[PDB]
Structure 1
Amino acid sequence: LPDSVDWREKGCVTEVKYQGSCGASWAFSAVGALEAQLKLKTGKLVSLSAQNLVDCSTEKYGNKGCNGGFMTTAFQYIIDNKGIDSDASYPYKAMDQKCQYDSKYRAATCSKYTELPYGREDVLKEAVANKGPVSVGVDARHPSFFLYRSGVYYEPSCTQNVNHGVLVVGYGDLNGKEYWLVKNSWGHNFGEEGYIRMARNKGNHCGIASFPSYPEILQ
């Protein structure tokens, strides 16, 4: 219902991360959403361990660490494992390590996650306004993505087949041109201090609505 949202206004979005040479965007997209539920439920913002996901959410979850994975099964790992460690206690090293999860430093839980209908930007808007930041994949394979600096991103070559996990933390328009507020994991020097505004309501542009999902911390 709100014509614009931005979850950084309510202190639900941590600092932008730098995934480096490790292909772990699924891990960063996942913790990003669970961080936002953790501030909602408890009132505390704290970065969750991407390294935990990479090191421990593996073959049983269909993931391959720095060579790809999925945000959905990363949520299933957190459910199964009954927790996830803080970034502070389990820092990211942009490489594949042995699982070193320590329940002592558990910072967040997961009760469930929810996948959204393919391509439904109306339904995606609802979840971002009513439930919190939503994990999505995008097609980020195109040179314009890499060269993105600011403004509303539109790429007529863009397809609906996604290949890069990111986090939708809000939405709006730029003098009418509508967009999704996307947090990426390429450090603050990428985009708009780490963010990219990608075209919204342009037929699932770059497949931002192809496979959305978001976790929940239930009471």
Structure 2
Amino acid sequence: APAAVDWRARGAVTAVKDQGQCGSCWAFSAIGNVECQWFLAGHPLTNLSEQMLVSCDKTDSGCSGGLMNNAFEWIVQENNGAVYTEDSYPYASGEGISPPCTTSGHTVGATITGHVELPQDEAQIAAWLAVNGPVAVAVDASSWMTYTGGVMTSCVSEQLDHGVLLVGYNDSAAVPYWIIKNSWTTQWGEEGYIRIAKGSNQCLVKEEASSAVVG
């Protein structure tokens, strides 16, 4: 695989968002992945709706958590593949309470047809990402609250609790690293991103990697 990849160089990644006090990271991870896959399929980069998932995907648990794979399945199996635009279905859960689902008044911004669940293998995830784009992953982010920069090599890796988006890596650095988009504003980390060490399953990053499929 290439020595380093960063999908931001293709303009394939939307701006860092703010999930607020809702436990909706699963939706931010899934939607961020869809946004990138939609762009890479040859469509304009479009901000898509986390709120659609938080409010309407009843296989997941709104502000009380969920799974990116469940979200991708819900989109395809219950919403005809459709993902609404953020502009037409804006986020409304930042205080920690998700409003009920609304079915009318929204605009389809992207469609997906399925999703892939990747091997639990950092090299194979990296190789897939190098060709196919950003990857939704679950991590243990319980230790991340005060991160301000650098390659995190001290990640409590006890239990998955947070969904994020792998956007790249650099295998050439002395401590190789993943590049990860978070959903805690640009005031957190490195303009809203974090680098974690790559190759030792830091933060359990290899354990639940997946991507939507567009087309």
Shorter chain as denominator, the TM-score bin is over 0.9
What residue is the counterpart of 1:187 in the other structure?
185
Match of 1:155 in 2: 154
> Is the Cα contact below 8 Å between 1:85 and 1:103 reproduced in 2?
no
Superposition deviation, residue 187 in structure 1: 0.4
Structure 2 residue identity aligned to 1:28: F
Partner Cα separation in structure 2 for residue 19 and residue 91 of structure 1: 12
Partner of 2:63 in structure 1? 66
Per-residue CA distance 1:49-84 (angstroms, 9 max, x = gap): 0000001111xx2x1100101100110111121201
Q: Work out whether residues 85 and 101 of structure 1, in 8 Å CA contact, stay in contact via their aligned partners in 2.
A: no
SS of the residue corresponding to residue 146 of structure 1 reads coil
How far apart, CA to CA, are the structure 2 residues paired with 1:103 and 1:77? 20
Deviations 1:122-174 (A, max 9, x none): 111112111110000111112xx111101101116x22531100000111157
Which residue identity does 1:131 align to in structure 2?
N
Provide the residue aligned with 2:14 in structure 1: 14
Aligned partner of residue 34 in structure 2, secondary structure: helix
Aligned residue number for residue 163 of structure 2: 165
1:154-211 Cα offsets, whole Å, 9 max, x none, are 116x225311000001111574211110000000000000000011012x11101110
**Residue in structure 2 matched with residue 122 of structure 1 by the alignment:** 123
Equivalents in 1 of 2:5, 2:66: separation in Å? Answer: 28
C-alpha separation between the residues in 1 aligned to 2:11 and 2:126?
Answer: 19
Could you list the runs of 5+ residues in structure 2 that have no partner in the other structure? none
- Structure 1 unaligned blocks of 5 or more: none
SS in 2 for 1:114: strand
* Alignment of 1:32 onto 2:29: no
CA distance 1:104–1:87, shift in 2 (3 Å): closer
Whether the 8 Å contact between 1:137 and 1:210 is mirrored in structure 2 is: yes
Counterpart AA for 2:191: E
* Higher helix proportion (structure 1 or 2): 1
SS at match of 2:188: coil
- What does residue 79 of structure 1 align with? 76
Distance change >3 Å, CA 134–CA 49, structure 1 → 2: same
Write the letter of the residue equivalent to 1:112. Answer: G
CA distance in 1, matches of 2:38, 2:189: 26
Q: Aligned partner of 1:180: which letter?
A: W
Q: Of the candidates 110, 135, 142, which is equivalent to residue 108 of structure 1? A: 110
Normalising to structure 1: TM-score of the pair?
0.92
Aligned length: 210
- Percent identity, please: 41
Cα distance in 1 between the residues matched to 2:116 and 2:67? 13
**Compared CA separation, residues 174 and 111, structure 1 to 2 (3 A):** same
TM-score (ref. length: structure 2): 0.93
